Amino acid sequence: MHVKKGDKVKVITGKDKGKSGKVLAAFPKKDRVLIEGINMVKKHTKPSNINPQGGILNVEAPIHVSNVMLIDPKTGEPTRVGYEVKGDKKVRVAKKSGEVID
Amino acid sequence: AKECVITGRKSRSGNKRSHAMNSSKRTWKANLQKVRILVNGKPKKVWVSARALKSGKVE
RNA sequence: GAGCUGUACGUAAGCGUUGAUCCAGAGAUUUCCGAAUGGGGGAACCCACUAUCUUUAGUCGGAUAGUAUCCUUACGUGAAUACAUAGCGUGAGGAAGGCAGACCCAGGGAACUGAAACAUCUAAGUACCUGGAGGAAGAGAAAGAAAAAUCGAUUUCCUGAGUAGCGGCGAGCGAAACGGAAAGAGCCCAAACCAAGAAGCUUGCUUCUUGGGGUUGUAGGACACUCUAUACGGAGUUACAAAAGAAAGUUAUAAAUGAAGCGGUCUGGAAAGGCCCGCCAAAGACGGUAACAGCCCGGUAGUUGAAAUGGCUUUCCCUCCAGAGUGGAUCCUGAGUACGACGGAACACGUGAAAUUCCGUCGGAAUCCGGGAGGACCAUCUCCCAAGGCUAAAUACUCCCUAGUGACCGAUAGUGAACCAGUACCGUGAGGGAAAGGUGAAAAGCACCCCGGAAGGGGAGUGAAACAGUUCCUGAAACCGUGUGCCUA
RNA sequence: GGGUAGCGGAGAAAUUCCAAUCGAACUUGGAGAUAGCUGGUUCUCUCCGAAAUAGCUUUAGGGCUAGCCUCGAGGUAAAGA
RNA sequence: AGGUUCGUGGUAGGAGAGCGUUCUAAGGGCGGUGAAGUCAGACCGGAAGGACUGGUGGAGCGCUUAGAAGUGAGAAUGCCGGUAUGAGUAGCGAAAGAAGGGUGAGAAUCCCUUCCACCGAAUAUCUAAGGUUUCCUGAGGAAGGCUCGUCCGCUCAGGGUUAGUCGGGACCUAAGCCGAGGCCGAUAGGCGUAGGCGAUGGACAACAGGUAGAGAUUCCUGUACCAGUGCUAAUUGUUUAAC
RNA sequence: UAGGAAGAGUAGUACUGCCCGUACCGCAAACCGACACAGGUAGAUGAGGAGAGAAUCCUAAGGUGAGCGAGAGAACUCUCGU
RNA sequence: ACUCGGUGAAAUUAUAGUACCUGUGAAGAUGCAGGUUACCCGCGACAGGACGGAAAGACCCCGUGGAGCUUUACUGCAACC
Ligand SMILES: [Mg+2]
Ligand SMILES: [Mg+2]
Ligand SMILES: [Mg+2]
Ligand SMILES: [Mg+2]
Ligand SMILES: [Mg+2]
Ligand SMILES: [Mg+2]
Ligand SMILES: [Mg+2]
Ligand SMILES: [Mg+2]
Ligand SMILES: [Mg+2]
Ligand SMILES: [Mg+2]
Ligand SMILES: [Mg+2]
Ligand SMILES: [Mg+2]
Ligand SMILES: [Mg+2]
Ligand SMILES: [Mg+2]
Ligand SMILES: [Mg+2]
Ligand SMILES: [Mg+2]
Ligand SMILES: [Mg+2]
Ligand SMILES: [Mg+2]
Ligand SMILES: [Mg+2]
Ligand SMILES: [Mg+2]
Ligand SMILES: [Mg+2]
Ligand SMILES: [Mg+2]
Ligand SMILES: [Mg+2]
Ligand SMILES: [Mg+2]
Ligand SMILES: [Mg+2]
Ligand SMILES: [Mg+2]
Ligand SMILES: [Mg+2]
Ligand SMILES: [Mg+2]
Ligand SMILES: [Mg+2]
Ligand SMILES: [Mg+2]
Ligand SMILES: [Mg+2]
Ligand SMILES: [Mg+2]
Ligand SMILES: [Mg+2]
Ligand SMILES: [Mg+2]
Ligand SMILES: [Mg+2]
Ligand SMILES: [Mg+2]
Ligand SMILES: [Mg+2]
Ligand SMILES: [Mg+2]
Ligand SMILES: [Mg+2]
Ligand SMILES: [Mg+2]
Ligand SMILES: [Mg+2]
Ligand SMILES: [Mg+2]
Ligand SMILES: [Mg+2]
Ligand SMILES: [Mg+2]
Ligand SMILES: [Mg+2]
Ligand SMILES: [Mg+2]
Ligand SMILES: [Mg+2]
Ligand SMILES: [Mg+2]
Ligand SMILES: [Mg+2]
Ligand SMILES: [Mg+2]
Ligand SMILES: [Mg+2]
Ligand SMILES: [Mg+2]
Ligand SMILES: [Mg+2]
Ligand SMILES: [Mg+2]
Ligand SMILES: [Mg+2]
Ligand SMILES: [Mg+2]
Ligand SMILES: [Mg+2]
Ligand SMILES: [Mg+2]
Ligand SMILES: [Mg+2]
Ligand SMILES: [Mg+2]
Ligand SMILES: [Mg+2]
Ligand SMILES: [Mg+2]
Ligand SMILES: [Mg+2]
Ligand SMILES: [Mg+2]
Ligand SMILES: [Mg+2]
Ligand SMILES: [Mg+2]
Ligand SMILES: [Mg+2]
Ligand SMILES: [Mg+2]
Ligand SMILES: [Mg+2]
Ligand SMILES: [Mg+2]
Ligand SMILES: [Mg+2]
Ligand SMILES: [Mg+2]
Ligand SMILES: [Mg+2]
Ligand SMILES: [Mg+2]
Ligand SMILES: [Mg+2]
Ligand SMILES: [Mg+2]
Ligand SMILES: [Mg+2]
Ligand SMILES: [Mg+2]
Ligand SMILES: [Mg+2]
Ligand SMILES: [Mg+2]
Ligand SMILES: [Mg+2]
Ligand SMILES: [Mg+2]
Ligand SMILES: [Mg+2]
Ligand SMILES: [Mg+2]
Ligand SMILES: [Mg+2]
Ligand SMILES: [Mg+2]
Ligand SMILES: [Mg+2]
Ligand SMILES: [Mg+2]
Structure with a gap:
């Protein structure tokens, strides 16, 4: 998915809209996150x-x-995310600030 | 297997007709005779038609 | 590129950035039955022989390989019976079985029905059975179509035309050529002769094999001579002879990148909706996300990517190659064949004035000063050269794979089957053959208290909703009840 | 434990039996056989409105032509009652 | 558009004008401030029919003009589903039971005791076929059991079947079946020799006891037999040839 | 007997002996009859008194009291007795 | 059988508040006419009617229906000479 375990999250819609949190688990098979x-x-x-x-x-x-x-x-x-291969690794890039998130 | 070994003619089907033109199924047979000929350097008994026998074969 | 050990919860034990699970190409392993093939057998079982090895003190046990039948071929042994053959043995090659309920070629071949009865006729060379195939099959390079003039191998489509015809002249059956298109391609033998060998001795001859030569109707070839040519050039594995090997390119089978709103506010359980503002677009396909999203997610247009294997196209390599002319002594040009009688069948054509093609049985030609056809047949003319073989494309169909489409269905519909369906069930068997979709956005699937053995309830709690409580969206009618305004012995 | 299979078999013979089926078994296919016969055929209103006869018929409870209904169009030296 | 006159029962049947259902196209709309569907009303049109208002429902649907049809059901001894009436009615499938204790939420029906009754060339004991876990133990009581059930051939979870000698194969053959070559035949195939399968028959070595959840000529205890093998110890034989 | 043959038997000891079935019902509630169904289902054994007897009646060993009951004692129907 | 406790079907059925006599009528009426009787709801019994239920009459006729059988009906076929 676009979001990994251990990431920081802003909740965009729902009853908890506007809140922030951390990823404790990810369920890519069913496309959910804890x-x-x-x-x-x-x-x-x-x-x-x-x-x-x-x-x-x-x-x-x-x-x-x-x-x-x-x-x-x-x-x-x-931010939406882009992908740039810098060195020997492909890293995630913030598409507003134009910088590397990782 | 009941057929001539030279020019292998055998039975074929057709119609038997009457006056009033009623139609029934019948066959025509070849007159194969059992004769001893040289199928190889050796002789043996085989079915040969009387037509294939009036010029060419060795009894 | 961060989780994973399926459906499928859960417990348990573990594994992954020293890069797992996962996706694609290529390999290895692959019990037993089944053509089943060492022998047998009531399917998935039973019992062996021969070699080599292994274990035990030795019987007992274990491992590996071979061992079916028929056809073709090579070698060896070998009877009545002297030579020899049959037979027997060994080796080497090949076959066998299945199916896509389709398409096509062949052998065999109905009846119901229609004729307002019925037998000729129809249905129909259909259904069905059997045998051969191939990715297509079949047909195919004129013994043709024609007719005051010509055409020039097959196949398929449009016309001709419901015409000409056939027909208890009833019911019905029903063409072809010309004309217009799709697609287009032509070739190898046999025989005259040459050269070599072998067998018979047909005894100095024929007849067998191999190689060369040669294939046609204005007749062509053999045969005689001229000219050139042995790779200068030409052709090729789709016919025309057949088997290989390289390189370049492209394509298929995993993937990568990819623009733009967390915009404000209203309702709401939740905004993708309403109102007010922006932006992207070679991208406003489709799907998801708590309600209807180009700008949230997977993506989309555009642009990229292949270690490995497959296909296709070019180039190289490789392989194989005589073709013009002038003559007319002699020679060759498919024999039990073509045809005819008799009995049948196919031709739109039912025996008819019946040409043309095929089958069974009898008889039976000519051969270039020759033969066939032009719907009986004769004469004239015109066209053609049978009795050998091969050949792509245009045509038919879909069990499948990939990408899509629909004024097609929406759970009694659409497949019999949206659900563990050819299942449950029925039948000795062949065979017949169902019913059955929907909690919620998310299990948050009701802790705790009370009556009861439990089931089941009443609260409390979750949720937007519990009158959504694990046959759970909605929830009609029949049918079964409780209460009551008016009437009734 | 075996053999005989439907254009067939078996029968001390009754049309008797061949899987509760027999003057010709069961199953699948031709097949949606054919049925001049019986049954059924689903919304509304407006205008008009019959026949149950003749002839022929392997015809007689079927058909065909005529007669009788309906819709449209024509022509008059107006033909109908 | 307005008049005048004459008309307006109807089966088979002819002619005309329309209503409603699903889908498509364009225009224009509605809808979580609540769509379709469903329920109820004393509304509108000449009919088929059409609105409005409220409850339930919880996500899609009208209108206009055209177009296309799987186009409208009360009857087919119609097909499938649901539910009635008969009706608390017929039946509850041959037979002897009684009481006292126990268990349990609950007992005519389950367990125990005593008395009584029935079969006894069977209604007793073995064993082929056929069935296929129904067998034993511990739990259980929704459904099944023609009543009840604390019980069960029912549900759940764990168990249980031991062979040189028993029955079958590794032994034999009968009827019958298959059948290398072979004979016959449109195809497919039919028949058949050598050979081989095939018991319901022939041949073939084990008895008596014990076993308290479930096996016994099988396990265990005693005592045997059949076929073989090695190792010991004596005997004997060698190619006029033990065996 | 044809044949094969230098090893053979004898006594004692010790060791070797495969595959399949084996539970349970089996005149029956477990098999064939759609059923926990008055039917059908090969063979072995099958005691006593009285008796010719495997007849008949009562019993042995062994096995059962039958998967709806209780109480009244009408017509009528069935199976019985005078 | 009957009463009580347990369990619990079926054939049939257009809707039913379902008298009698004489008549009428598709010619034999619970339902039509004129009269005569008759308070409402059951239980045990009997069969006169509902042209009672069951089975699209096997008799009879019809269909240019079928099948089995016969013969000096017609036309054929096997087999035999
Ligand atoms: Mg014919
Ligand atoms: Mg002949
Ligand atoms: Mg002759
Ligand atoms: Mg393996
Ligand atoms: Mg086999
Ligand atoms: Mg075999
Ligand atoms: Mg076995
Ligand atoms: Mg060994
Ligand atoms: Mg030889
Ligand atoms: Mg000799
Ligand atoms: Mg094949
Ligand atoms: Mg094939
Ligand atoms: Mg015929
Ligand atoms: Mg025909
Ligand atoms: Mg025809
Ligand atoms: Mg075939
Ligand atoms: Mg092929
Ligand atoms: Mg092709
Ligand atoms: Mg071909
Ligand atoms: Mg040509
Ligand atoms: Mg030619
Ligand atoms: Mg030409
Ligand atoms: Mg074409
Ligand atoms: Mg040549
Ligand atoms: Mg020349
Ligand atoms: Mg916002
Ligand atoms: Mg709110
Ligand atoms: Mg918005
Ligand atoms: Mg697009
Ligand atoms: Mg979308
Ligand atoms: Mg957006
Ligand atoms: Mg000649
Ligand atoms: Mg001619
Ligand atoms: Mg002729
Ligand atoms: Mg012509
Ligand atoms: Mg010609
Ligand atoms: Mg060809
Ligand atoms: Mg539904
Ligand atoms: Mg759901
Ligand atoms: Mg849901
Ligand atoms: Mg309690
Ligand atoms: Mg509870
Ligand atoms: Mg509701
Ligand atoms: Mg609800
Ligand atoms: Mg309700
Ligand atoms: Mg209701
Ligand atoms: Mg009331
Ligand atoms: Mg028959
Ligand atoms: Mg008799
Ligand atoms: Mg009879
Ligand atoms: Mg109209
Ligand atoms: Mg409507
Ligand atoms: Mg719209
Ligand atoms: Mg409604
Ligand atoms: Mg309503
Ligand atoms: Mg209403
Ligand atoms: Mg609601
Ligand atoms: Mg139309
Ligand atoms: Mg339609
Ligand atoms: Mg429909
Ligand atoms: Mg109606
Ligand atoms: Mg019907
Ligand atoms: Mg019905
Ligand atoms: Mg239902
Ligand atoms: Mg029904
Ligand atoms: Mg009922
Ligand atoms: Mg008691
Ligand atoms: Mg069981
Ligand atoms: Mg029960
Ligand atoms: Mg009962
Ligand atoms: Mg208890
Ligand atoms: Mg039990
Ligand atoms: Mg044994
Ligand atoms: Mg044996
Ligand atoms: Mg013995
Ligand atoms: Mg010894
Ligand atoms: Mg063994
Ligand atoms: Mg064993
Ligand atoms: Mg027993
Ligand atoms: Mg006596
Ligand atoms: Mg007695
Ligand atoms: Mg006793
Ligand atoms: Mg009671
Ligand atoms: Mg009762
Ligand atoms: Mg009256
Ligand atoms: Mg009363
Ligand atoms: Mg008639
Ligand atoms: Mg009959």
């Missing part, structure tokens, strides 16, 4: 070996990758 502090759900969980006490656990849920834009590490605004 982002910290974003799209919290409440699960009614019975007591089990995992989660010994159970209850109403408040955790995170995936959102679609199209509702996401990368944050420039310096300019700090959502």
Whole structure:
């Protein structure tokens, strides 16, 4: 996908529009991403070996990758991304600031 | 296998007709005779038609 | 280029930037049955022989290779029976079976039905069975079509034309040439003769093989002489002879890059919608994203990319090559053939005044001073040269692969089958043959309390919605109930 | 455990049996056989409106021509009642 | 456009004008401030039909002018699905049960005890065929069981079948079947010799006990037999030739 | 007997002996009959009294009480007795 | 069979608030006319009617329907001479 695990994310649409977060996991097969502090759900969980006490656990849920834009590490605004092969590696390039995100 | 070994003619089908022109199926056979000839440097008995026999073969 | 160990959740144990999972080309491995092929057999099983090796103290056990039948061929052995043949053995090559329910060639070949009955006729050389194929098959270089003049190998399409004809002259069946187009291409033998060899002895001769020569109707060739030519030139694996090897280019089978709005505000669970502003465009195809997006994502136009394998096209290499003329002694030009009688079939043509083609059975020519046709046949004329063979393209079809299209269907429709469908089920068998799609944007799939053994409920909670609660969008009618305004013994 | 198969087989013979099927088994195909016979054939209004007869017919509960209905167009030395 | 006159029952049937459904094209629109569909109303037109308002629903659909049709159902002993009536009706598939304890949420129906009754050339014990896990143990009670069920040939999870001698093959053949060469025949194939398959028959070496969840001539304990092999110890034979 | 043949038997010891079936039902609720169906299904064994007997009646070993019940005791129908 | 507890079908069916007599009518009426009877809802019984249910009458006729059989019907074919 265009967004990797460990990246910084600005949420572009949805109920959490305007918020920012970090990628905790990526699901390219189904095209979803898990982002910290974003799209919290409440699960009614019975007591089990995992989660010994159970209850109403408040955790995170995936959102679609199209509702996401990368944050420039310096300019700090959502940018579309380009790809430039610099040296022996192809790196991602911010298309507003014209600089290398990686 | 019932056929002449030279000019291999055999049975063919056709019609038998009556007066009033009723049509039925029949065959025509060749008159193959069982004769001993030289198929090689050796003799053997084979079917040969009486037509292929009136000039050329060696009995 | 960052996650991965399928559907398919989950648990467990692990692997990946020292670059995994994944995608494409090329390799290796590939149990048993099945043409099944060492023998047998009731499918996926049973039992071997011969060589070489291996284990044990030795029986017992293990590994590898070979071992079916028929056809062609080489060698060897070898009967009645003397030579020899049959037979037997070994080796080397080849075949066998399947299918795309299509297309085409051949052998065999119905009936229902129509004729307002029915037998000739029709249906129909159809259905079906069997055998051969090929990517196409079949046909094909005039013993042709014609007719005051000519054309010039086949095939397919348009016309001719429902014409000319056939026909219990009923029902019906039904051309061809000329004319206009698509596509176009021509060639090898046999025989006269030459040269060599071999067998018979047909005993100094014929007849067998090989090589050369030569293929046509104004007749052509052999044969005689002139001219040139043995690679100067020409041709080629699609016929015309056949087998290889290189290089360049292109294409197919993975991919890369790729412009422009997080614009403000309203409603809302969510904006791609409304209102107000911008921008890109060789890119406003299509799909996704919480509602209807050229500017969010995958992408699109444009421009690039191939280690490996395949195809195609050129060039080289390689290979193979006599063609003009003038003569008219003698010679050659497809024999049980062409034709005819008899019995059938195919020709639009049902025996008819019946030409033309094929089959079975009998009879049976001429050969250049020759033979065939022009719808009985004769004469004249005109056109042609049978009884040997090969040949691309234009034509037919689709089990498949790639890219697309539709005033085609939308779950009783469209395939029988949108779902683990030729399945469940029925039948001894051949065979017949279903029903069955939809939670939500996201499992956030209802912690906890209460009645109950559970099922099932009532709260509480999630969600925009639970009257969306795992046959779950909507939710008609029949049909079954509870309550009630008016009437009724 | 085996053999005989439908234009066939078996029958101490009854048209008897050949997988609950037999004056000619079952299955698939020709095949949507053919049916002058019976049944069925789906929205509305406006104008007109029959026949159940003659002739022939392998014809008689079928057909064909004429007669009778409807729509359109014509011509008059006006022909209809 | 307006008059005048004459008309306006209708089956088979002829002629005309229209309504509504799906799709296409152009124009012009509606719609999360709620589309289609569905429900209910005392509205409009000469008919087929058409609006308006409210509930449910939760994403698409009208209008105009043209065009094209899988174009309108009440009947076919029509095809498929759903649901009635008969009706709490017929039936519940040959037969002897009773009580006391137990288990359990729950007992005529499950377990135990006692008494009674039935079969007994069988309704007892083996074993071929056929079936194919139905066998044992632990859990279970939605559906199946013509009632009930705590039970089960039912559901779930784990188990369970041991052979030199038993039955079959590695042994034999009958009927019948296949069949190298062969004979016959439009094709396909039919018949058949050598050879080979094929038991329902012939030949062939093991008995008695024990085994408390499920196997027993198979496992175990005693005592055997059949066929072979090596190793020891004696005997004997060698090409007028042991065997 | 034709043939093959220098090894052979004897006694004792110890070792070797493959593949397939094997559960369970089997006059039956497990097989053939669409059913937990008054039908059908080869063979071996098959006790006592009385008896010719495998007839008949009552019993042994062994196996069963049959997958809807209780209570009333009308017509009528069925199977029985006078 | 009947009453009680458990379980629980089917053939059939245009909608039904479903009397009798004499008549009428496609000529034999629960439903039409004129009269005569008759409070509403059931349970156990019996079969006169609903031209009761079941099976598109096997008899009879018709169709230019079919099939099996016969012969000195017609036209054929095998086989034999
Ligand atoms: Mg004919
Ligand atoms: Mg002859
Ligand atoms: Mg002759
Ligand atoms: Mg393997
Ligand atoms: Mg085989
Ligand atoms: Mg074999
Ligand atoms: Mg086996
Ligand atoms: Mg060995
Ligand atoms: Mg030889
Ligand atoms: Mg000799
Ligand atoms: Mg083949
Ligand atoms: Mg093929
Ligand atoms: Mg015929
Ligand atoms: Mg014909
Ligand atoms: Mg014809
Ligand atoms: Mg074929
Ligand atoms: Mg090929
Ligand atoms: Mg071609
Ligand atoms: Mg060809
Ligand atoms: Mg030519
Ligand atoms: Mg020629
Ligand atoms: Mg010419
Ligand atoms: Mg063309
Ligand atoms: Mg030559
Ligand atoms: Mg010359
Ligand atoms: Mg914004
Ligand atoms: Mg809001
Ligand atoms: Mg917007
Ligand atoms: Mg475009
Ligand atoms: Mg789009
Ligand atoms: Mg945008
Ligand atoms: Mg001659
Ligand atoms: Mg002639
Ligand atoms: Mg002639
Ligand atoms: Mg001519
Ligand atoms: Mg000519
Ligand atoms: Mg050819
Ligand atoms: Mg639906
Ligand atoms: Mg869903
Ligand atoms: Mg959804
Ligand atoms: Mg409780
Ligand atoms: Mg609950
Ligand atoms: Mg709702
Ligand atoms: Mg809903
Ligand atoms: Mg409802
Ligand atoms: Mg309703
Ligand atoms: Mg009321
Ligand atoms: Mg028959
Ligand atoms: Mg009799
Ligand atoms: Mg009979
Ligand atoms: Mg109109
Ligand atoms: Mg409508
Ligand atoms: Mg529109
Ligand atoms: Mg509605
Ligand atoms: Mg409504
Ligand atoms: Mg309404
Ligand atoms: Mg709603
Ligand atoms: Mg039209
Ligand atoms: Mg249509
Ligand atoms: Mg339709
Ligand atoms: Mg109607
Ligand atoms: Mg019908
Ligand atoms: Mg029906
Ligand atoms: Mg249904
Ligand atoms: Mg129905
Ligand atoms: Mg019912
Ligand atoms: Mg008790
Ligand atoms: Mg089971
Ligand atoms: Mg039950
Ligand atoms: Mg019951
Ligand atoms: Mg209990
Ligand atoms: Mg059990
Ligand atoms: Mg044994
Ligand atoms: Mg054997
Ligand atoms: Mg024995
Ligand atoms: Mg010993
Ligand atoms: Mg073995
Ligand atoms: Mg074994
Ligand atoms: Mg038993
Ligand atoms: Mg006695
Ligand atoms: Mg008795
Ligand atoms: Mg006893
Ligand atoms: Mg009761
Ligand atoms: Mg009852
Ligand atoms: Mg009255
Ligand atoms: Mg009453
Ligand atoms: Mg008639
Ligand atoms: Mg009959």
